[PDB]
Every structure is written in structure tokens, then in C-alpha cells.
Write a protein that binds this ligand. Structure first.
Ligand SMILES: Cc1ncnc2c1ncn2[C@H]1C[C@H](O)[C@@H](CO)O1
Ligand SMILES: Cc1ncnc2c1ncn2[C@H]1C[C@H](O)[C@@H](CO)O1
Ligand SMILES: Cc1ncnc2c1ncn2[C@H]1C[C@H](O)[C@@H](CO)O1
Ligand SMILES: Cc1ncnc2c1ncn2[C@H]1C[C@H](O)[C@@H](CO)O1
Ligand SMILES: Cc1ncnc2c1ncn2[C@H]1C[C@H](O)[C@@H](CO)O1
Ligand SMILES: Cc1ncnc2c1ncn2[C@H]1C[C@H](O)[C@@H](CO)O1
Lengths: 237, 237, 237, 237, 237, 237
């Protein structure tokens, strides 16, 4: 057990799905996993382990922000034998052609955080996902007949940005979505030799904001989870 | 209600104590406040309001890391009329003469985050606490007979830092405790016009690795709470 | 005609292969393309346009370094309607398990250059390739019975760096190859909305000089061009 | 004797007041100290020692700018046993509600200098004053019946700044006064192990341009001196 | 032989002229040098060695950009005993009083590149030419009845910069011409203890396109080569 | 009159010699100027105006550090019509072949200050002297039969550097001397359109330190002044 996870080696599957909200982890466990058991509850960051179509899978929250998710993914990788981490969250869109409920896959993640410069001697470290994992996710999406865009995400340190000028910049350089952790997770994955992937559903449009129905948003969130779960099965083959 | 807090103006007191752990907030509400009511549970970030010696007080967790607590402190200030925020967290010590369960008051907070450089045109912003609040905390401690060092804290983005030599640099400059929020809260307090102070209890020693050996509080982590609550009363008079 | 390309709209195909060595441009047109015609000679940077299995394709060198290739790729995209750019070059390896003559595909590219920071408000822009282009290259190689590594490349501004320790850092973070263009090309593609990919052959193993024949080099080089050319057709399908 | 001070251990009191102007030091020695003796004149930086109500005290100018005062404060601490340094200077106001001759106490000091980044591995060092000294100054002011704001100062490298919009940024973050030494002195105090505090008298208003109109002191610049001297006595008790 | 130059010690003179356009190398050997012989062809970068009025001299292009010229100048200095490097190229002007076809000598070179910061601990290294070489060029021009401007050049990493405002800044600080090599060459010369100079002809006036004949261009170009060649002889005297 | 100079237009010559020490200005005035009168004494920074061989010349101190000398040179240029500034000071040497009493001329000046980045949009501004002034100084030196090296100086913000690693770096890149203001003065000269030059005599050897006789050091200091004064006369022709 670690300071943030009160569990023991074996308690987690070698693959962990991670939403930002801990309550969302219980929701995932309850909806898609069979014979699921709770394996952590320290600081309320609920974690579960069960099976998906006979495949052992875990799901646990990582909180908001790079500093927060950096702690959990690191401990899982170095103390619980986790080989793959899949973040499943939400994001805001800046590009006009990107609509609400769009499923985005971050093959890369930009950031205003300084954590990767600290690791990479003040230089530019391209925070990227594991290729095979992105490929498995894209294929799983196609099988479920779901679009899915693959590109850059932007991991912000400030949800409430002091100067909203970066949004024009993000849009200019093709950023698909704005969230708060992909760059941190990709950084730890590279630092401790593991594999990670971030998938998001567009929950708003920075400028436009727009709106839809709850039943439809909830349907789209489940598609994301199904894509994540099915991508793991393809990876096993 | 705000994007991360489902409450209305009036649900929170003008003063809020904030530990990083929502379960510590719950404990604080159950142990020190009377007629405590839960006012928030979104994303599991439990928030409570009650009274301490007739004084209306609130206590809510803020999660781990600057990006996380920046969201919560901001929403409380702009949408719930919160005038004062007192962080009651834990920290790691780097100085040889700093023992576990020691209480520190951060009049200042150093950091390796980029959030304040982003607010201050890439220059050095001295993230400092409110002077009167620091003074109230000092007097509250003396009256309670609890020792408490006043000085600089260091707000880290990476709990598992790649740069171990930076701790030597921290020690050389007299850093009293390493945590993950102070500089960020002080930045928000200044950006949105509110007052803040960070009080911490040494829970780990980065050198000796002696972690929170021997319980998790029982009295000291309670000491921190007594000082915070009593300092608030001095501020009212 | 542009400052560095004396040609008109239509002279270049929507897809262009670009070697670092300008002499390789004519070699490719002669060895792999049919009905090739010269389309540029300014500053001795010979450009050719022809067809590969009916598909229109162009080839022209970009010169060594980010500044140089940034010029050509930009002019090609904004003034000659180019939609995809494939850099075909060489790199040095820092990972012991990455062998000489290995074919690596850069899904991402790290760098010590300032160009992207100038474009991204001094933040971390993740310079990445176009996902489909990466997958096309991986599949084309497999079909050619060639094993290919997909990962991060490092684009150095200084071939003769005074910072020897940086090679240890690159290895620790899994950098597959060191070259001098990818990050610059990926920045341009993002800035002007185009697609790009860099494929490199391991020409040497930094800190471990090993020998290789001239017959082997041509063979590996021809393999890389075949991989790139076949990848374009898959991209069309 | 040190490279810039021709005196011997014992010539200075363990506490030294330092205005940027050597002529102000002379004035202070002649007006407030008894049996004042000149202990230095190298480069014209006049230094004096005498007593205030029986308490041994010294007063020496430090020149304009961080590089200048960094030299003098360092030499005093390492070669003359000086334990406390109180800067008594002038500053420019950016806030609309700050009037000429107002007294400010810098509990913290922001800066555009690079000296502290050079000491703190390019991270953010919160340049702060000694808490007890700040408190002594506050009490000394109350007892004397002099108003005094406690907060952040901004230590500028360029008195004639090219960046005028930075003043708006300073105002937004509540900077009480703009001067040129505080952050540097606090850095030295921390590096060489001593205590410091900066007290300033508003001499200019950067917005209204109303400079030190109406004399150069007569009583207020004397107020600053009374507070400094009296705060020292409180510290001894 | 070096990675980019297939020659041996002695093939190059101790002085080398370097145009950005590789095609100009053969033109110079044919038009100004006597008994020229080819000494390099790797990557199509033709190098020649001959004599001018008995003085041994070599000429070879460096390619566009700091990264490219840094390679060649370095190899020439460390492996071919070269002592002086004179870059002869073109530049764009931002000062209205600097006319088209003007000859400018860069005593210093500003830059937006990171190469020198990597060499100088992230501090400001002033990339300067060799004083005697500057004076030799000024005197040679005067003797040729040509007026020459000596001052600062700006070496840009991006010919197509997204930061349009930077040209206003360069003008305000007196930048005589904008090119893409000088600062890199000056860094190399300083790093390996050699002498260097950059001479450029104003080929265009940024933000003010003006016309010029092809006969005029050759004339000005020949003038620059004569200035450079005659400067070497003065340097010998 | 300005806040730092109590004089009026006409009081200073259009050429001003500036030592760091104000007492050294009186010394220069007394030793080389005829009919010299004091024109400033604010903050003890003595300034004088007299004539040298019929040429009107001024001499005034600038204090230690870039922030200090930046204030004076700026006011002289924009408020007193000064066209040329010549700093005449001392410096420490890092290069072995540079000896005590060597006369160094800084055609360029590196620095760890941030003032030029603030002016040059965070880029590299090569802080250089005016060419004609360097040329006049070199020629004046030759006429007086004095050696004089021309090259880079290093303007340090910290006389007492926290980490003496930069000295090896300075030595590696050929820095002739270490002082504390040239880069600041060259920056203001470029900002307000004036001309400046810095000349220094080596007063110590960072590592070696060495030693000589006072009579000889004083002779060398006078040679420097004579070189400065005579250089002005050549400039008039
Ligand atoms: C619009 C926007 N900006 C930043 N983060 C966003 C976002 N929309 C969603 N997120 C994500 C990432 C965080 O974990 C959380 C913040 O509410 O949801
Ligand atoms: C070593 C280290 N670094 C950063 N924060 C640390 C730490 N040891 C303890 N902490 C503290 C601060 C956080 O608020 C908390 C996170 O678990 O513990
Ligand atoms: C070992 C090494 N380092 C940097 N760039 C390298 C390299 N080996 C090959 N390259 C590539 C990229 C450049 O375009 C060129 C430099 O010789 O070949
Ligand atoms: C506008 C401005 N900037 C920086 N320092 C200023 C200022 N106006 C006044 N000062 C103060 C601080 C110094 O200690 C002193 C220098 O003359 O005046
Ligand atoms: C306008 C402009 N900008 C940048 N570099 C320029 C230029 N005009 C000429 N050059 C020079 C330097 C490069 O080597 C090449 C770029 O076309 O010519
Ligand atoms: C060794 C050394 N380092 C930094 N500055 C030096 C120096 N020797 C002389 N100086 C100069 C510049 C300052 O104005 C003053 C500092 O004593 O002398």
C-alpha cells in the first residue's frame, strides 16, 4: 500500500481505466464490470476491479489536474504492476468543426504545465500516447460504428484562465480538445516505462458552448467506455 | 451552482477551511462543527457548513494539486461570497530540525508551477498569505500552547519529483514544508480579490522517509484545526 | 513562384517526399517514379514530379535543420496546394535495443528548438504526425515484411551539442532516433493545416559506432522509399 | 575590511538601516543617532554607527538596484556579524488609493530580476521578509500613530521600464510600491542566513506622475525612520 | 574526412568564404580564384580551394539556417584547421534609411534561436564578430569606394514568422538586416576558438517590396565578394 | 533637472566618461580636465564638466550594477543631450592569457541580467558598442603604444555568484573580462538611439587573482582614461 492507495499487489488489473470523477468510477464499475469489488477508497478516490467479457479490468478516479493524476498513475505503474492506463474523460472544444458528443483520442497532448520541462532539461518533450493503444481504440470505435477524431489535446493547469488568448492559439494549431491531465499522464508513462492513452467526449464548446439532451450525452459517454474496454480486448490479440 | 459545486449563495460561510482530502473535511465537520450540513458532493468533493462557538463556518476538500484547488477556491470566491480561505493540509519536511506532526504557517509559498508566471507576465510574483490572518494564526497557537513555525512553503507539481537535488536547494533556502497548493491558492486569492492562509502539519520527512508513522492525527492534525478555527475568531474581533 | 521555389500551382503533387540530402531527390525520381519532370532548381534544390503506380507524387530535398525545412514545407503548403509531406531521412540511435538500419516512424518529435514555443505562447506544443499517415506507414512496412518502430524522435538544433548529458535523458524517455527536422515540419503542418510524417533509417548508434556496408545502406534506403510510397496509396484507400 | 567596505568586525552594530542614498544615511546618523561615527566611505557609500536610546545602531547606504545592495548586504552579513538589515527607501505607487508619503511594509517582494531564479533552479522563490521584524514594524507604527500598509513590493531592474503595461499587472495584483532592492535583499538574507525587512515611503505616483512634490521628507521620511528604529527595540525585548 | 566533408587536413585554406546558396560557391571559384580545385561534394555542398592574389582561400556554401551552418563551420574549425570564416549572403531590411543593395557588416547578431542559450547556461551570450575582421571589411569597402553599415544583424529561425510585431522591435533597436546564420556562426567561433564575420547585401526591404535588376544584383554580389576577399589581405597585413 | 541629476541642459558635454565610483569621477576631473566645475551631487554621484585639450568633456559616476547605470545613462541621453557615453572601469579576468593591468575594450557584452530580454521580446539581443567608438579607442591605444584587447565582457548581476560554475563557461567562450554594467548601457544606448563604449583594466583574476604594484595599477588606470579622452578627439575628426 502507498500513501494514496490502500491496496496490495494483485488488487488491480494490469490495465486501468481512469475518469477524473471518483463517482464516475463506481458508475463504470457498476455498469460494465462483472463481479466487481472495491479495492481503494483513500481520500475518496474509489477504485474497482472486475471483469469485462472475462478480461480482468480495473477502474479508478484520478482527480482534477496533472499533479493529481500524476500521483495515481505513478503508484499504479510502479507499485501495482499496471502496464496500461486509459484516461476516459471530457473536454471543451475550440475548433468549429468539432461538435458536442464528439469522441476525441489524444495521440498527443500540449500543455502549459512545466512538469515535462522539469523532466526533459527545459526542452520540448512531445507528450504522446502509445501507438498500438491509439490504433486499438480507433479500430474498436469503427467496429462500434463511431466516428472518433485523433489528434492533439491541450492539458491546462488553469481551468479558469487569466487571459483567454490561448484559445485562439489552440484553435489555430488544431487542438481537438481542452482537458487537464493527458500531458501529465503521458509524461509519467514515458518516465516509468508504461503505456497510456487519453480518450474524451466533447462536453462543451469554449466559445459556442451549445447544448443537447442528457440521454444523448449519457449514451455518448458509454460509447467512450465501450471503446476503451473493447480496445483492450483487441490489444490482447 | 457552479461547474464544480452544486450549492447556492448562502450555503457557505464567509470563511472556509480546506484540506486536500474530502474525508478530512467530513471528519472536521463531525468533530468540530455543530449542526453541520453537507452542502456539496459533486465529484465527491464533500463540503460542509455549521458553527464553531456560534460562528458560522464551512469546511470543504480541494483535491490534490494547484490546478484542482484553483478551481474550487475560485468558484467559492466569485459565486459564494467567501472572503477567507484557510488551507489545512499536510506537508513533507526537508529541514533536519523539523519533526513529524510539527505545525507550519506559510507566510509565503515558493513553487515550480507556471501558473503565477502566466498571471505575472513571466516575472516573479511573491505568493504571500494575508498578514492579519498569519498573525491571528500565530496568536491562536500561543493561546493554545501549540508550537508553530512561520515561513516559506514550497508548492510542488510533482509529488514524485525527478529532481531530487531540488530538495537540497529547498533546504538551503529554509523551506519549512513541501506541499502542493499554497502558491496556487495565494495566486487565486490575489487574482479574484480574497484573503488566504495555509497551515500544514508535517506528515512525512523527505530525508528520513519516516512517513506519517503513528496514526494519522488523533491530536496534532487536530491542533492545526484548533489554530485555524480559533484564529478566525480573533479575526472577527 | 515563391522565394525558394520557381514553379507554379500544379507543378507539385498534393503529396511530396522530402529527403535531407538534396542529391537523393533525383535518385528517387529516376528509381521509383515514372514520367518524372523537373519542377525546381532554385539554390540547387532540385524538385521532381511524376507518378508511382498511377498516383501523382513529387520529391524534393529540404536541407538540414528546422529553419531550412520550415521554409520549403511552408511554401509547398500555402502556395502549391500540398496536403501531405513525408520526410524520408536518417537518424542516430540512443536506445541499445534500437539497431543500425532500423526503420523508425516518428509519431511525435521532441526538440531543443524554440520555433514551436514562439508559435505556442512559450508553452508546450506537442509536435505530432498525422495519425492515418503513421498507420499507413506501419501497414506498408508490414506488407513489405519490414519491422518498424513507432515513437518519439528528437529534433536537435545542434548536431554537435555541448550538452552530452542530454543523450542520457533522451534514452531514459524512449527517444527512438535523433535527427534535425521532424518537430519543425510538424509545427508547420499544424500552423497551416496540412498533414506530415517523418520516417527515418538508423544510420548510426550514438556513443557506439558500428559498421555497415554501402550495399546495405542503399537497400535500407530503397526500403524506406518503398514504405513511404506504398503508405501514400493506402492513405488513398 | 571587505572588497567594498573598509571597516573591521565590531565597527557595525548587529542591526543596520539601509537607504539607497548615502546622503540619507548621513542625515539619519546626524538626526537620530548619538555619538555617530563614520565607519566607511569607500566608493562614497557612507556608513555610520551610533546609538538610539542606548541601543547600538548602524546606518549605511546601499546604492540603487539589486546588484548594488546585494554586494553590501552580503559583506555586512558574512564579515561584520550583522544579524538584521532594515531597508528604509522610497518607492513609486501604482494603486489609485495610495498617496505620496504613505508608508509601506514589504512582507513580500515581486521582481523582474533573475537573481532568485539563478539561486532557485529557475523556479519561483517567494522573496519574503522576516515575520517577527514585520510584526515589530507594525506595532512600532501603531504606537507612534503612523498608518502603514503591509503587502507586496515589486523590485524593478529598470526604473525607466520599456513595458508600461506591466504596471497594470502590478496594480491588478495589489502591489503597494515599486522600488529596486527588496527581492534582492530577501534573497541574500536567505542565502547567507540573516534577517531582513524593507520599509518604504511613497515618493512618486507612477500614474499621476505627482513626484516627491513638497519637500523631500521633513517628517514622513522621518516617520519611516522612527518606525524602523522603534521596531528594533521591540525586537530586543 | 568528417560526417559532412569528405576531405583531409590541408584541402581547405585557413580562411573560407561561405555563401548560403551552394550554387554561388562554384561561381566564386571560377570568377575570383585562380587555380581552383574541388575539395568537397558530400550532399551536393561543393567546396573549392584556390588563391586570390597569391593568398590561399576556400569557398563552400553553408545552407540556410543556424543548424546547417553550425555543422559546416564546426567541422571546418575542428578538423580542417580553419581560422577565419566569412559568410557572404543577403538580408532583408527593416530600417527605412537602409536601402536595397546596401552592404551591411554584422559586428553583432541578435537571434530568436536557443542554440547560444544552450551553450551559455540560459544566459545572454553576445554573439559578435572578430573586431579586426570587421575593421578589415570596412577598410576594404572604403578602398573599393563602397559605403558600408556596421551594426547588429538578427538571425531568424523562422523565415515565415507568425510574430509580425517582432519586425517593429528590430527596427526600434537598429537591426540593420535580417538573415538566418550569423548568430549561429558567431556561437561556433566562440565555442571552438576561431574568428568569424558575416557580410550581407540588402536583397529586400521587409514590409516595402521594391524592384531591382538582375544586372544590379550580380554587380552588388561581386562587390561583396571583392570586399570580403580584399578584407582577408588587409587582415594578413 | 531629473530625480537623479540636479543640473540643467547644457551642464554636460555631449560626451560623458563614466567610472563606477563617484570619487573616481572627481579624481578624473581633477587630473585631466581644465576649468572643471561640479554639475551634480545628488545621492553623492558627483559629476563634472571641463575641457580636455580644448574639447568640452564631462565625467560622472554611475554606481554599481546595470539598474544603477541604466538610470544615469538614460537621463543623460534623453534629458541632457548626451550623444556618447564611455564607461571606464575595472573587471576580473577568467582567461589565462589575460593578465593584470590589461586594457580590455568590450565590443560586446554578455549578461545574466533579464533587462535586454524584457526589451527584446524574450529573445537574444546582442548588446554591442558603437563601432566607430571602438575603432577610435583602438587607434588611440596604438598611438599611446598600449596593447588593448577587443572582445566580449560579461555583465554580472551578482558579484558574489551563488554557483561559480559560470566562470568556466565564460572562460570557455572567450570572455575577456567580468564587470557589472556594459550590457545595461549598450541596451539603453540602443533603446534611446545614442552611442556607448565600455573600456576596463583588469583588476584581478577570478581564479588566480595574482598581484602587482600600486604605482603600476595607477599608471594603467590613467592610460585607460587617456585612451578614452584621446578616442573622443579622433571621433571629432
Ligand atoms: C472546457 C474545459 N477546460 C479545461 N478542462 C476541462 C474542460 N472541460 C472539461 N474539462 C475536464 C478536465 C478536468 O479533469 C475536468 C474539469 O472540469 O473536466
Ligand atoms: C515529497 C512531497 N512532495 C510534495 N508534496 C508532499 C510530499 N510529501 C508530502 N506532501 C504533501 C503535500 C500534499 O498536500 C500531500 C499529497 O499527498 O502530501
Ligand atoms: C547522429 C545524428 N544527430 C543529429 N542528426 C542526425 C544524426 N544522424 C543523422 N542525422 C540526420 C538529420 C540531419 O538532417 C542530418 C545530419 O547529419 O542527418
Ligand atoms: C517608476 C519606478 N520604478 C522603479 N523604482 C521606482 C520608481 N519610482 C520610484 N522608484 C523608487 C525605488 C528606488 O529605490 C528609487 C530610485 O530612484 O525610487
Ligand atoms: C527577408 C529575409 N528574412 C530572413 N532571411 C532572409 C531574408 N532575406 C534574405 N535572407 C537570407 C538568409 C537565408 O540564408 C536566406 C533565406 O531566404 O537568405
Ligand atoms: C571580479 C569582478 N566581478 C564582477 N564585477 C567586477 C569584478 N571586478 C571588478 N568589477 C567591477 C564592476 C563593478 O562596477 C565593480 C564591482 O566591485 O567593479
Amino acid at each position: 500500500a502507498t500513501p494514496h492507495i490502500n491496496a496490495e499487489m494483485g488488487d488491480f488489473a494490469d490495465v486501468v481505466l481512469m475518469p477524473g470523477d471518483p463517482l464516475r468510477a463506481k458508475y463504470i464499475a457498476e455498469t460494465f464490470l462483472e463481479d466487481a469489488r472495491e479495492v481503494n477508497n483513500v481520500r475518496g478516490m474509489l477504485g474497482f476491479t472486475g471483469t469485462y467479457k472475462g478480461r480482468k479490468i480495473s477502474v479508478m478516479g484520478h482527480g482534477m489536474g496533472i499533479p493529481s493524476c500524476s500521483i495515481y498513475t505513478k503508484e499504479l505503474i510502479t507499485d501495482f504492476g499496471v502496464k496500461k492506463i486509459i484516461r476516459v474523460g471530457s473536454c471543451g472544444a475550440v475548433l468549429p468543426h468539432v461538435k458536442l458528443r464528439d469522441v476525441v483520442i489524444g495521440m498527443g497532448a500540449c500543455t502549459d504545465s512545466k512538469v515535462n520541462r522539469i523532466r526533459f532539461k527545459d526542452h520540448d518533450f512531445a507528450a504522446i500516447a502509445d501507438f498500438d493503444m491509439v490504433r486499438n481504440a480507433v479500430d474498436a470505435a469503427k467496429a462500434l460504428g463511431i466516428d472518433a477524431r485523433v489528434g492533439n489535446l491541450f492539458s491546462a493547469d488553469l481551468f479558469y484562465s487569466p487571459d483567454g488568448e490561448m484559445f485562439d492559439v489552440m484553435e489555430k494549431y488544431g487542438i481537438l480538445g481542452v482537458e487537464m491531465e493527458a500531458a501529465g499522464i503521458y509524461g509519467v508513462a514515458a518516465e516509468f516505462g508504461a503505456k497510456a492513452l487519453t480518450i474524451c467526449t466533447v462536453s462543451d464548446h469554449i466559445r459556442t458552448h451549445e447544448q443537447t439532451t442528457a440521454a444523448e450525452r449519457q449514451t455518448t459517454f458509454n460509447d467512450m467506455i465501450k471503446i476503451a474496454l473493447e480496445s483492450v480486448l483487441l490489444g490482447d490479440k
